[PDB]
C-alpha cells in the first residue's frame, strides 16, 4: 500500500458523476440523459442509446461531477470494446479541479465512419480510466444497448 495508491483512492472517495447527457452535436437535440454514477467502478453499468448516435458524426458530451478533492490534471481515457476487442481509444483532459468543486465537462467526441446497431448492441463496453496526471483513480466500464 502506497502514498499514492492512498492518494487515488481519496480522490475516488471523494468523487462523484451527478448526472450526465448527449446530444447531436449537429443539431443540439439530447439523445440520453441520465443522474446513475456511471464512474463507479466494481459494478458493470447498463446505458440503453438511441441507434441514431451511430449516425452522428460528433457527440457533444456533458459530465456534472463534484470532487472534495484536489486534482492537477483530471483527464479521461476511454477505450470502446466490442466483444473484448478495442476498436477507439478516445482521451478527455479536463485539467486543474478546485476542492469541493461541482464542475460541468463539455467534450466533443468524433464518430469513428459502423456496424449495424443490431450487431453492436449489448456488445459494446466502454471502459473509462479515470486519472488526476497519471495517477489512476478508478476503472468503470458501461454495456451499451442500441435502441
Ligand atoms: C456508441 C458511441 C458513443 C458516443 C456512446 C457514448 C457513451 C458514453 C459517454 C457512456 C460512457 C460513460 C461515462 C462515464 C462517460
Same mark, same amino acid.
Request: with cysteine; net charge neutral; proline share 3%.
Given at each position: 500500500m502506497s502514498?499514492?495508491?492512498? #492518494?487515488?483512492?481519496e480522490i475516488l472517495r471523494g468523487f462523484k458523476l451527478n448526472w450526465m447527457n448527449l446530444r447531436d452535436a449537429e443539431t443540439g437535440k439530447? @439523445? !440520453?440523459?441520465?443522474? *446513475?454514477? @456511471?464512474?463507479?467502478?466494481?459494478?458493470?453499468? *447498463?446505458? #440503453?442509446?438511441?441507434?441514431? $448516435? @451511430?449516425?452522428?458524426?460528433? =457527440?457533444? #458530451? *456533458?459530465?456534472? +461531477?463534484?470532487? /472534495?478533492?484536489?486534482?492537477?490534471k483530471f483527464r479521461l481515457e476511454q477505450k470502446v470494446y466490442f466483444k473484448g476487442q478495442c476498436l477507439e481509444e478516445w482521451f478527455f483532459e479536463f485539467? +486543474?479541479? $478546485?476542492?469541493?468543486?461541482?464542475?460541468? !465537462?463539455q467534450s466533443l467526441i468524433e464518430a469513428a465512419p459502423m456496424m449495424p446497431?443490431? =450487431? @453492436?448492441?449489448?456488445?459494446? $463496453? $466502454?471502459?473509462?480510466? +479515470?486519472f488526476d496526471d497519471d495517477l489512476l483513480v478508478? /476503472?468503470? #466500464? =458501461?454495456?451499451?444497448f442500441y435502441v
Amino acid at each position: 500500500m502506497s502514498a499514492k495508491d492512498e #492518494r487515488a483512492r481519496e480522490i475516488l472517495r471523494g468523487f462523484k458523476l451527478n448526472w450526465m447527457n448527449l446530444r447531436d452535436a449537429e443539431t443540439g437535440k439530447i @439523445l !440520453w440523459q441520465g443522474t *446513475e454514477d @456511471l464512474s463507479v467502478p466494481g459494478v458493470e453499468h *447498463e446505458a #440503453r442509446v438511441p441507434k441514431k $448516435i @451511430l449516425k452522428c458524426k460528433a =457527440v457533444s #458530451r *456533458e459530465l456534472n +461531477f463534484s470532487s /472534495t478533492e484536489q486534482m492537477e490534471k483530471f483527464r479521461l481515457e476511454q477505450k470502446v470494446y466490442f466483444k473484448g476487442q478495442c476498436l477507439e481509444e478516445w482521451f478527455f483532459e479536463f485539467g +486543474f479541479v $478546485i476542492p469541493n468543486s461541482t464542475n460541468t !465537462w463539455q467534450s466533443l467526441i468524433e464518430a469513428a465512419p459502423m456496424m449495424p446497431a443490431s =450487431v @453492436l448492441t449489448g456488445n459494446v $463496453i $466502454i471502459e473509462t480510466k +479515470f486519472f488526476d496526471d497519471d495517477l489512476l483513480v478508478s /476503472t468503470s #466500464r =458501461v454495456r451499451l444497448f442500441y435502441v
